[PDB]
Amino acid sequence: GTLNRFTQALVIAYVIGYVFVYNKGYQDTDTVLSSVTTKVKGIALTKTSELGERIWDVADYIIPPQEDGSFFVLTNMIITTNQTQSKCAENPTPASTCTSHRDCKRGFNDARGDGVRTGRCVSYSASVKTCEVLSWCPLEKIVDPPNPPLLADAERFTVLIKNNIRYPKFNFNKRNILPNINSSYLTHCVFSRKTDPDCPIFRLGDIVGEAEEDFQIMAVRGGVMGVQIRWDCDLDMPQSWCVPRYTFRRLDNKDPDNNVAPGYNFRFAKYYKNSDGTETRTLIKGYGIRFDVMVFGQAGKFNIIPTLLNIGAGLALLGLVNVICDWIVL
Amino acid sequence: GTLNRFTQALVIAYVIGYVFVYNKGYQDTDTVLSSVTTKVKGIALTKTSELGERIWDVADYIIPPQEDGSFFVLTNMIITTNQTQSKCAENPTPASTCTSHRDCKRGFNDARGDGVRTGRCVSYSASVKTCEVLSWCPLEKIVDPPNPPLLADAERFTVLIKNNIRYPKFNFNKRNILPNINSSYLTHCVFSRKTDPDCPIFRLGDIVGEAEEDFQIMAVRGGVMGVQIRWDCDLDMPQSWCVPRYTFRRLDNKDPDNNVAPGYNFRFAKYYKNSDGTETRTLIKGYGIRFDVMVFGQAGKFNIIPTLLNIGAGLALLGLVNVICDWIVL
Amino acid sequence: GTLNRFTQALVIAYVIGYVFVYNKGYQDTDTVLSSVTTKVKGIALTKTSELGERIWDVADYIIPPQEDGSFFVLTNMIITTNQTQSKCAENPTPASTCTSHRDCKRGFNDARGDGVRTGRCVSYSASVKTCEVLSWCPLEKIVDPPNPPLLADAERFTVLIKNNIRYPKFNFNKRNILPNINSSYLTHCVFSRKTDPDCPIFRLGDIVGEAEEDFQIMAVRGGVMGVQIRWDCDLDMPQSWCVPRYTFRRLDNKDPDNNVAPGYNFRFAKYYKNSDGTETRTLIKGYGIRFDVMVFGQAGKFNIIPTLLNIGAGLALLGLVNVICDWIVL
Ligand SMILES: *[C@@H]1O[C@H](CO)[C@@H](O[C@@H]2O[C@H](CO)[C@@H](O[C@@H]3O[C@H](CO)[C@@H](O)[C@H](O[C@H]4O[C@H](CO)[C@@H](O)[C@H](O)[C@@H]4O)[C@@H]3O)[C@H](O)[C@H]2NC(C)=O)[C@H](O)[C@H]1NC(C)=O
Ligand SMILES: *[C@@H]1O[C@H](CO)[C@@H](O[C@@H]2O[C@H](CO)[C@@H](O[C@@H]3O[C@H](CO)[C@@H](O)[C@H](O[C@H]4O[C@H](CO)[C@@H](O)[C@H](O)[C@@H]4O)[C@@H]3O)[C@H](O)[C@H]2NC(C)=O)[C@H](O)[C@H]1NC(C)=O
Ligand SMILES: *[C@@H]1O[C@H](CO)[C@@H](O[C@@H]2O[C@H](CO)[C@@H](O[C@@H]3O[C@H](CO)[C@@H](O)[C@H](O[C@H]4O[C@H](CO)[C@@H](O)[C@H](O)[C@@H]4O)[C@@H]3O)[C@H](O)[C@H]2NC(C)=O)[C@H](O)[C@H]1NC(C)=O
Ligand SMILES: *[C@@H]1O[C@H](CO)[C@@H](O)[C@H](O)[C@H]1NC(C)=O
Ligand SMILES: *[C@@H]1O[C@H](CO)[C@@H](O)[C@H](O)[C@H]1NC(C)=O
Ligand SMILES: *[C@@H]1O[C@H](CO)[C@@H](O)[C@H](O)[C@H]1NC(C)=O
Ligand SMILES: [Gd]
Ligand SMILES: [Gd]
Ligand SMILES: [Gd]
């Protein structure tokens, strides 16, 4: 009747429409197993006082040569050369500057944490004096990295990203490079959301940009881009219709006030032996943008069990539907 | 009756048999937290014109020394030595070869993307002329990597793989090396699907092979093996019965026509200072096989809530069972 | 009645109390997408016969400079210098020691697997003789790493850990550094479970320790710490209440008898060119502690579908509740 039939049709609408055709309640799910390969192409040019006219290619600016699922691109740096294990004068810092040996306590760390103080106080320059430490010497100088960044050419760098996934449960496998697409295209390809959406080759600047940030800006102090690949698939539909979605997100905090060590930089070195048999190194403090490819899928496919489950839920629900509807009238 | 009792027994069979004892509908689930360590043992020998009789050990052929959860094995290479930052003649390519300086536009990239053109056109050889670029010099030569691959000895290399997992929800922990197994065995152990299934030490060639590929073949141009470890566990049963399953899959596309940059290769370098204080490097373009250990578990254990849920679903379902069965007769 | 009303109230208690307010059956779930950055600060000092008074900073002791989501800290090492590709005498091992060339079969591997035997037998020392091999020479000596470990200063090292997460389904994002916390605090901050629970800067020793292990002990042979971050969130509640939980677990087996290659060590090298144009390297076998940051969240939020589902389950269940209760009396 008005109470029974109406309510019945209503719950029908709820399940079929809402829980089923809408929310896919008739499906069983699986999540993604994933493998990512990246390849960066490009060259940066630098001109520098104390350096020269210089090329930086993929071996120079990718560090290390591979991280599984992510790559770090060198954008900026501070470079200290001809360091050797020795003693030298600490950089002036309130705690660094010293009048005499009383101020320098041997065996203790330093403000920077780049040396160990020999109690001896030594003169930094003709004007100053500061604690002597044992370290790689001379110490890196306290300075900000250059603005604009030395490796700015990197905005123009390109990264091929190959990603293959599989859903173990459903035995389905797919590649992020789709069947239609041909090799030559992929010689000349560059990803474009409008023109070339199926091109796996992305431009560094375009990723930053696409994330509503700017390469050059972000490139002085460094930072972290997430490149998110999403495989959501209804495996009832054509395999063809199962495709990756790319989104881009800057991961690190731009707020200088709520964090520590903003941007992205790390120290790493190059070691040489001067022919004497004596070791010397070059310390680089690099900044850049780490890119994290991040892949997450979910697939789903028709299954009796959950279907029937939901149905039973509906049937049990209508019982209460009649009461709730009845007492709802006047 | 014939309608009621029969249907009742039928749905009983469906739930108990199908949704429960079959499909495990009485269980609650958790997924794996995982840690992987790998250790490669072996030595490769090479003999080469322009090189010599040479050894390559783990420090030489694993690059870099560690990636979390995966390792790259060096199989092939192209090696350019005594490069220094300088200018030189580009390699002949349709765009490379030049008659005069008009053809070379200063400040622009090159076909390879290994240099920046100074507008000056310089003669490659007595016969040819091509654009001058600033780069690490001399340039790597355009050539294919050697066939058969230099590091073929790597087929015979061995990798210990230790994998420890935990299911946070169920508090259960396990190691991929099982309790029975003893240390000496693990001195001499090599994984065998027939004889030694519980041996964590796998042979590179055997992984490739087990994946229905061939090391040597795959080793010229490089590539990617997935080593898949699966922990599916019914935590109702003995902990003893919770074990890893190993499968092996080549991840990259063998089709040359549907992709870019087939196989696996990357560039990386060794930097030296000639005693003058002058820098020089050796560029290696390596090929090899990256191995991705990929671990995915699911554990499940009895829970009242889902059990009862399913039951209710059944009871609600039978109501419709009577109607559907009745109207199904004649 | 006594049968009907009582049972009704009982199942009500079961669902509302147990399946709902207790077990959160009214919620829908999502799991974590995660990004981790780590930064190690500190300096180690070493004094050694055959070495000197020496500093080791972050470039020296972090290897390689970055792994995505985990870092390896150098604690101990065995160091072999001025190796060059050449031939030399193998280390005495039952299989190593040889009386004459019959005992040395050319072209075959060795016990250590660091060389290839030229059939020639050569005298190790004035006293002994052993097989000649082609290798980097001289060979690393068979010895245990030093006790106590050279890099013990590392116990005192500190690691900033930044972790940003997002739940794609619920669009919620959060950082492991919380809004209240201010920069200066994070200059001086060190994580403390009692005093400073919201400090992202952890002390290596304190992590080991917190895991009921000891840095120094674990530091001779190396090993693996899991640093587990857990984001469990009810997204019904305040975003404020969504926070990370840190736990710490040693991942590797301390049992020497049930495994292979205990602790954590790997080989890696430094390559130099002696001015002749001749290559030489330094082989380091390092030990240390790899730290794996491991992040797993689950978020949940109210949803009609599962709520109603469970309800229906309840209603269907009570039907059986009446029978089970009735037949339960006398
Ligand atoms: C191998 O596969 C490629 C896959 O791209 C394919 O060539 C492409 O064919 C399609 C269909 O004709 C075209 O794609 C684009 O479609 C948009 C509309 O959505 C147009 O606005 C695009 O304009 C292009 O203009 C130029 C086309 O040459 C490009 O310089 C520019 O980047 C735009 O893409 C474009 O038409 C298009 O024709 C190409 N895509 C491109 C960029 O080449 C083809 O089937 C196969 N290639 C061959 C020749 O075997
Ligand atoms: C420590 O644990 C090891 C675990 O392997 C164990 O030694 C093993 O015992 C079992 C049971 O007797 C044996 O395993 C194998 O079983 C298959 C049948 O499924 C046989 O066909 C195998 O044939 C072997 O032949 C040789 C055995 O020495 C091997 O050269 C060869 O690789 C095959 O494995 C084999 O019998 C077997 O006896 C060993 N496994 C091996 C290979 O050693 C033992 O309990 C413990 N070790 C000790 C001595 O404490
Ligand atoms: C920016 O945020 C910081 C966040 O810590 C905050 O300063 C802190 O304020 C709280 C609240 O007064 C204090 O936290 C601690 O609370 C526990 C009790 O649970 C106390 O036992 C702690 O004792 C501290 O003693 C010293 C405090 O200076 C520390 O040396 C020691 O490590 C303990 O933390 C402590 O009171 C505390 O006052 C600080 N936390 C610390 C350690 O600084 C403040 O709101 C903001 N900072 C500023 C000044 O803007
Ligand atoms: C390296 O050791 C060699 C022998 O292999 C020795 O002749 C030479 O002196 C060493 N070079 C240096 C810098 O000590
Ligand atoms: C390195 O600097 C040292 C002082 O530490 C200096 O004496 C020497 O000239 C330098 N070596 C080179 C190659 O310039
Ligand atoms: C390196 O090559 C240069 C030319 O760029 C050459 O003059 C020099 O001999 C080489 N150095 C060595 C050690 O052979
Ligand atoms: Gd710009
Ligand atoms: Gd073969
Ligand atoms: Gd201690």
mmCIF file of N, CA and C and ligand atoms in Angstrom, chain C residues 180-185 190 192 194-198, ligand 3:
data_model
loop_
_atom_site.group_PDB
_atom_site.id
_atom_site.type_symbol
_atom_site.label_atom_id
_atom_site.label_comp_id
_atom_site.label_asym_id
_atom_site.label_seq_id
_atom_site.Cartn_x
_atom_site.Cartn_y
_atom_site.Cartn_z
ATOM 1 N N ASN C 180 51.062 23.961 16.322
ATOM 2 C CA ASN C 180 51.517 24.690 17.500
ATOM 3 C C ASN C 180 53.019 24.976 17.424
ATOM 4 N N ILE C 181 53.777 23.903 17.248
ATOM 5 C CA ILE C 181 55.232 23.894 17.328
ATOM 6 C C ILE C 181 55.886 25.002 16.494
ATOM 7 N N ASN C 182 56.865 25.675 17.089
ATOM 8 C CA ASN C 182 57.535 26.809 16.467
ATOM 9 C C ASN C 182 59.002 26.534 16.103
ATOM 10 N N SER C 183 59.517 27.269 15.125
ATOM 11 C CA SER C 183 60.858 27.046 14.578
ATOM 12 C C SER C 183 62.027 26.966 15.558
ATOM 13 N N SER C 184 62.098 27.885 16.518
ATOM 14 C CA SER C 184 63.222 27.939 17.461
ATOM 15 C C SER C 184 63.270 26.663 18.272
ATOM 16 N N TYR C 185 62.096 26.292 18.776
ATOM 17 C CA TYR C 185 61.906 25.036 19.463
ATOM 18 C C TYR C 185 62.546 23.951 18.627
ATOM 19 N N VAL C 190 64.762 18.037 20.840
ATOM 20 C CA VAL C 190 65.106 16.605 20.702
ATOM 21 C C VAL C 190 63.972 15.710 21.214
ATOM 22 N N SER C 192 61.445 13.523 22.967
ATOM 23 C CA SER C 192 61.355 12.864 24.270
ATOM 24 C C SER C 192 59.930 12.402 24.522
ATOM 25 N N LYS C 194 58.479 11.722 27.216
ATOM 26 C CA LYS C 194 57.904 12.457 28.353
ATOM 27 C C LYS C 194 57.831 13.961 28.101
ATOM 28 N N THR C 195 58.984 14.620 28.101
ATOM 29 C CA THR C 195 59.031 16.060 27.862
ATOM 30 C C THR C 195 58.689 16.541 26.424
ATOM 31 N N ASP C 196 59.329 15.998 25.388
ATOM 32 C CA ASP C 196 59.158 16.580 24.047
ATOM 33 C C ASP C 196 58.615 15.617 22.981
ATOM 34 N N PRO C 197 57.375 15.128 23.159
ATOM 35 C CA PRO C 197 56.729 14.109 22.324
ATOM 36 C C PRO C 197 56.425 14.572 20.898
ATOM 37 N N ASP C 198 56.311 15.878 20.729
ATOM 38 C CA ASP C 198 56.054 16.453 19.416
ATOM 39 C C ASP C 198 57.312 16.940 18.691
HETATM 40 C C1 LIG D 3 56.395 27.071 20.722
HETATM 41 O O1 LIG D 3 55.984 25.752 21.033
HETATM 42 C C2 LIG D 3 56.616 25.182 22.153
HETATM 43 C C3 LIG D 3 56.194 23.720 22.132
HETATM 44 O O2 LIG D 3 56.921 22.983 23.091
HETATM 45 C C4 LIG D 3 56.155 25.877 23.442
HETATM 46 O O3 LIG D 3 57.079 25.739 24.507
HETATM 47 C C5 LIG D 3 56.638 24.665 25.373
HETATM 48 O O4 LIG D 3 55.480 24.969 26.136
HETATM 49 C C6 LIG D 3 54.968 23.903 26.927
HETATM 50 C C7 LIG D 3 53.776 24.418 27.742
HETATM 51 O O5 LIG D 3 54.186 25.343 28.735
HETATM 52 C C8 LIG D 3 56.036 23.263 27.833
HETATM 53 O O6 LIG D 3 56.171 21.877 27.515
HETATM 54 C C9 LIG D 3 56.664 20.955 28.551
HETATM 55 O O7 LIG D 3 55.618 20.361 29.323
HETATM 56 C C10 LIG D 3 56.008 19.332 30.226
HETATM 57 C C11 LIG D 3 54.772 18.805 30.954
HETATM 58 O O8 LIG D 3 54.056 17.900 30.136
HETATM 59 C C12 LIG D 3 57.045 19.886 31.210
HETATM 60 O O9 LIG D 3 57.416 18.940 32.195
HETATM 61 C C13 LIG D 3 58.244 20.349 30.384
HETATM 62 O O10 LIG D 3 59.374 20.723 31.161
HETATM 63 C C14 LIG D 3 60.320 21.374 30.270
HETATM 64 O O11 LIG D 3 61.363 22.045 30.948
HETATM 65 C C15 LIG D 3 62.048 22.941 30.089
HETATM 66 C C16 LIG D 3 61.075 23.993 29.542
HETATM 67 O O12 LIG D 3 61.771 25.088 28.976
HETATM 68 C C17 LIG D 3 62.737 22.153 28.971
HETATM 69 O O13 LIG D 3 64.140 22.284 29.062
HETATM 70 C C18 LIG D 3 62.415 20.666 29.050
HETATM 71 O O14 LIG D 3 62.867 20.075 27.856
HETATM 72 C C19 LIG D 3 60.921 20.395 29.250
HETATM 73 O O15 LIG D 3 60.224 20.441 28.018
HETATM 74 C C20 LIG D 3 57.771 21.492 29.480
HETATM 75 O O16 LIG D 3 57.345 22.597 30.268
HETATM 76 C C21 LIG D 3 57.371 24.024 27.746
HETATM 77 O O17 LIG D 3 57.347 25.227 28.507
HETATM 78 C C22 LIG D 3 57.802 24.276 26.291
HETATM 79 N N1 LIG D 3 58.583 23.162 25.761
HETATM 80 C C23 LIG D 3 59.908 23.311 25.658
HETATM 81 C C24 LIG D 3 60.766 22.128 26.019
HETATM 82 O O18 LIG D 3 60.429 24.375 25.294
HETATM 83 C C25 LIG D 3 55.842 27.364 23.264
HETATM 84 O O19 LIG D 3 54.446 27.562 23.374
HETATM 85 C C26 LIG D 3 56.357 27.988 21.955
HETATM 86 N N2 LIG D 3 57.659 28.595 22.179
HETATM 87 C C27 LIG D 3 57.745 29.921 22.285
HETATM 88 C C28 LIG D 3 58.529 30.437 23.463
HETATM 89 O O20 LIG D 3 57.202 30.685 21.476
#
